[PDB]
């Protein structure tokens, strides 16, 4: 009876603190910035071979190798320049939802509705790809995973928690609690000190890896948050939701900067990404295509319109010369 | 091109061959999703994710039981959904109706037919005959209901259980008829804990579903 009023007073204090800093908007300082113009991108490669919906995709650090996962139960490594296949990896379960590629190029990870994250070793003397470890402990399904190094990985699940794992022993070293709903997406900072997580409670949190504490909580969306990307300099969020809106958050002004929306878009958003310089923001929709946004102006610079079903995957290479997309029509396309 | 690139191309071609080989076996199995509440008797209708397999007349089926807002999206390619309701617990039928409405009107399931099992009929018969609890206590509109003239009761059945069964089945069928517009169909059935025929019913309904798809493909409907 006494504590709810204290919580409301603290929330009002935070709300009043945030309003004091809103002395300008992006829409006014960018009045002196030229538009990017019209951007045309064309298909350069088509990658064929999957027999089911594609759910996950990830680039390597050398900008040629690519990993993808689908409901046919197989995980494929592609050579983007020649379209040759390098490996084909069977999965023990076909209900896969995420995959990731190690920054050193030695390992690959995946997981799904089996509540387990599985790690594969790509470099053996026998010539085969083998399973190295199974990480158990979550109670919901596994929604996203990313490597920090060869021995540390972060996972997010549908049981409202996040975890940091020690791959050598298979034990959970930090558990991150504080959400009230299912957790969808993670994005790891370039300096590998902080990560950001979205959830079905329409909020986003900033976590400190080394201590296990929540530092900030952001709000504003009206429905589930499906995707998060992390601006290159380490100080901004890009988030997308089922309410057909994208938003840009700042960690130092601790409030929203710009909203990306249009009257003709009434479907949800599946994927969000940036280019190297941060000028373009790429987004996937249920309207069977992908839009190109001007991150500093909230205009629409272009569109990619080559798929016959939902776009589920979107990614950009480390050298910035290519974009890959994936759909439920079982195809991948390389754009430039 | 270099000899090493030709060897890489041969490896890629062999991988494509083996990917094509595996797909042929996958298409020969029909996949089913099983949903239902506790106490409904899900586990007995054909007796992270639990699985079961069974075969009738040389056609294989694969049924999945998970454990609903998010994981449901990946089950939009299944042939049919099986939904099981306990028909002998009057307090919790409104929950079953609300769940049925939430599954019928889901935007990711707009082309999937539902096979509906109304379970535990013997307990309903015993309770209606005993008369210690009445439907009118929870459903006032039952006081005005009459058994239709085209009813086909099983011989020997008391004409107070047929009224209850048809009222309960009407309550579920009425939701399905309000929306859908011909793209997907509901298939009601009455069952009990001791029945064994349940496997054949699924086979017949699946054959009907595939027949409807083939008729639509040929510009006949």
């Amino acid at each position, epitope marked *: 009876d006494q504590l709810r009023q204290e919580a409301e007073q603290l929330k009002n204090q935070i709300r009043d603190a945030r309003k004091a800093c809103a002395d300008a908007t992006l829409s006014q300082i960018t009045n002196n910035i030229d538009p990017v113009g019209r951007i045309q991108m064309r298909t350069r490669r088509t990658l064929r071979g999957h027999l089911a919906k594609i759910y996950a995709m990830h680039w390597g650090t050398d900008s*040629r*190798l690519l990993v993808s996962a689908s409901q046919d139960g197989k995980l494929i490594i592609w*050579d983007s320049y020649t379209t*040759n296949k*390098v490996h084909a990896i069977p999965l023990r379960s076909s209900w896969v939802m995420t995959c990731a590629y190690a920054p050193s190029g030695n390992y690959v990870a995946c997981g799904g509705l089996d509540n387990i994250c599985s790690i594969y070793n790509l470099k053996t*003397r*026998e*010539g*085969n790809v083998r399973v190295s470890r199974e990480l158990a402990g979550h109670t919901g399904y596994l929604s996203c995973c990313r490597f920090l190094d060869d021995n540390q990985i972060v996972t997010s699940s549908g049981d409202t928690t996040c975890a940091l794992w020690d791959i050598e022993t298979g034990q959970q070293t930090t558990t991150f609690t504080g959400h009230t709903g299912d957790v969808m997406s993670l994005s790891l900072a370039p300096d590998t000190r902080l990560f950001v997580s979205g959830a079905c409670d329409a909020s986003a949190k900033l976590w400190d890896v080394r201590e296990g504490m929540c530092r900030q909580t952001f709000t504003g969306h009206e429905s589930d948050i499906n995707a998060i990307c992390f601006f290159p300099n380490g100080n901004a969020f890009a988030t997308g939701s089922d309410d057909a809106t994208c938003r840009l958050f700042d960690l130092r002004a601790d409030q929203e900067l710009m909203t990306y929306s249009h009257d003709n878009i009434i479907c949800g958003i599946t994927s969000v990404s940036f280019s190297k310089s941060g000028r373009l923001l790429l987004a996937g929709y249920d309207d069977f295509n992908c839009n190109v946004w001007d991150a500093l102006k909230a205009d629409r610079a272009g569109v990619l319109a080559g798929h016959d079903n939902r776009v589920s995957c979107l990614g950009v290479t480390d050298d910035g010369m290519a974009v890959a997309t994936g759909s439920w029509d079982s195809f991948l396309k390389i754009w430039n | *091109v*270099s*000899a*090493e*690139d030709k*060897a*890489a191309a*041969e*490896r890629s071609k*062999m991988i494509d061959k083996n990917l094509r080989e595996d797909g042929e076996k996958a298409r020969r199995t029909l996949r089913l999703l099983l949903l239902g509440a506790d106490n409904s008797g899900k586990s007995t209708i054909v007796k992270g994710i639990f699985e079961t397999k069974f075969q009738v007349d040389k056609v294989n089926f694969h049924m999945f039981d998970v454990g609903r807002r998010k994981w449901i999206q990946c089950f939009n390619d299944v042939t049919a959904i099986i939904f099981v309701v306990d028909s002998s617990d009057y307090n919790r039928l409104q929950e079953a109706l609300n769940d049925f409405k939430s599954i019928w009107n889901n935007r990711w399931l707009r082309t999937i037919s539902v096979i509906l099992f109304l379970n535990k009929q013997d307990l309903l018969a015993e309770k209606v005959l005993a008369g210690k609890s009445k439907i009118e206590d929870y459903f006032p509109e039952f006081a005005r209901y009459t058994t239709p003239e085209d009813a086909t009761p099983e011989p020997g059945e008391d004409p107070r259980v047929t009224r209850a069964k048809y009222f309960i089945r009407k309550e579920f069928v009425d939701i399905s008829t309000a929306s859908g517009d011909g793209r997907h169909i509901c298939y009601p059935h009455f069952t009990c804990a001791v029945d064994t025929e349940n496997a054949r019913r699924i086979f017949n309904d699946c054959k009907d579903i595939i027949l409807q798809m083939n008729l639509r493909e040929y510009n006949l409907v």
Partner: single-chain antibody
Amino acid sequence: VQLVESGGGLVQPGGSRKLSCSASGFAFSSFGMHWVRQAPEKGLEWVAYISSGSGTIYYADTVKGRFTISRDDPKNTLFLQMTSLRSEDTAMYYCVRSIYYYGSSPFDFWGQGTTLTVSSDIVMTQATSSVPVPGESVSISCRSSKSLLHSNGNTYLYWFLQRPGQSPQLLIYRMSNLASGVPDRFSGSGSGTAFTLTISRLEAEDVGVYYCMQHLEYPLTFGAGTKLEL
């Protein structure tokens, strides 16, 4: 990872004999295989090659019509059938494992070998016969008749070491990639038609004959060999 060769012995000119190799410890069906020959006073020579799926077969220009290479995946054995043997066929025969995909190491493991007793090409040139020489720096050179640099950015040069009583061991592939298990004392470089190998600090285990091989076009060719005498 183990490869064992069998067969061999003494034959008369005009006869025939068949060799076999038994593989274990790895996915035999995923690798391509080579036969390489060494004569007492000649160095190494390439003989034949069979692809992993038995798709393609190549032969040397001195053995076409006389030698036949075959594969048996379910039993993990290779065979080489030889007919109409000549005096020039007396030599040591080695079995070599190879796999090709982006980033692989195609000549990593060599067998032990067996003995047989009877009774346009790119030229790779090495010329010093012996380098006299612990703790000193040594540089060994090779030179080719045609450029080994392909338009895709790769240059196809390989280095091998043969210690006394041992099979050749892979050191460097594609001119600069240090093979697994090798200490970081070895390095290599070059451009176009001239190549060098550098050893930063010698030990007692760095004594033997060093070979160069090119892998642009078939037939495969080797150099004469440079002997390092400590």
